[PDB]
Amino acid sequence: MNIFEMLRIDEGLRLKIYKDTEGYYTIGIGHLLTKSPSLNAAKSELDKAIGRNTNGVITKDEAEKLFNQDVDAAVRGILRNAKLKPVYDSLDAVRRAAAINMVFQMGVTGVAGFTNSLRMLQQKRWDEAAVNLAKSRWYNQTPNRAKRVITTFRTGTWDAYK
Numbered sequence: 381m382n383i384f385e386m387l388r389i390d391e392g393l394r395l396k397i398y399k400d401t402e403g404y405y406t407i408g409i410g411h412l413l414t415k416s417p418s419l420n421a422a423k424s425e426l427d428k429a430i431g432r433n434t435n436g437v438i439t440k441d442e443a444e445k446l447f448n449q450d451v452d453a454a455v456r457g458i459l460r461n462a463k464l465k466p467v468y469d470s471l472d473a474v475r476r477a478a479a480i481n482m483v484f485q486m487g488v489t490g491v492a493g494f495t496n497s498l499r500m501l502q503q504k505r506w507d508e509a510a511v512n513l514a515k516s517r518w519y520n521q522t523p524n525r526a527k528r529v530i531t532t533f534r535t536g537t538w539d540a541y542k
């Protein structure tokens with residue numbers, strides 16, 4: 381298992397524009413296009429991302445390419461945030477994937493906001509962090525996913541992804 385497979389499980393794969401859990405326009409493997417309610421705006425952003433007149437539909441290859449770019453950006457975003465880097469650096473490989481998953485879903489900013497959890501993670505207090513991480517909108521809104529990620533931080537294993 382690895383970050384790619386992990387996120388592909390969590391985000392799924394859709395080749396036509398769709399609405400995410402928050403109702404925003406998305407495509408491919410969790411690639412958010414826009415937060416605007418305008419489908420044209422969405423189509424506009426898609427064509428621009430892909431470099432062609434897509435008409436709201438893309439191929440598998442295209443999705444994967446968006447995905448690579450997006451994983452890359454998440455890691456790099458982490459390494460460039462002063463609150464996150466130190467945390468991430470202190471973690472083992474499985475758990476770094478858990479951090480990346482979170483950033484992929486909610487952004488650097490969003491994750492950098494879990495201050496108390498971050499501290500707990502840095503201190504390697506796994507059970508405690510797990511509890512704090514669950515006291516969040518994130519968990520309340522996407523519980524099955526949140527649970528999978530939280531278990532990953534808790535255990536440093538891939539068992540939640542079987």
Ligand SMILES: [Cl-]
Nearest residue numbers: 428429430449
């Ligand atoms: Cl892009």
Ligand SMILES: [Cl-]
Nearest residue numbers: 522523524525
């Ligand atoms: Cl969920």
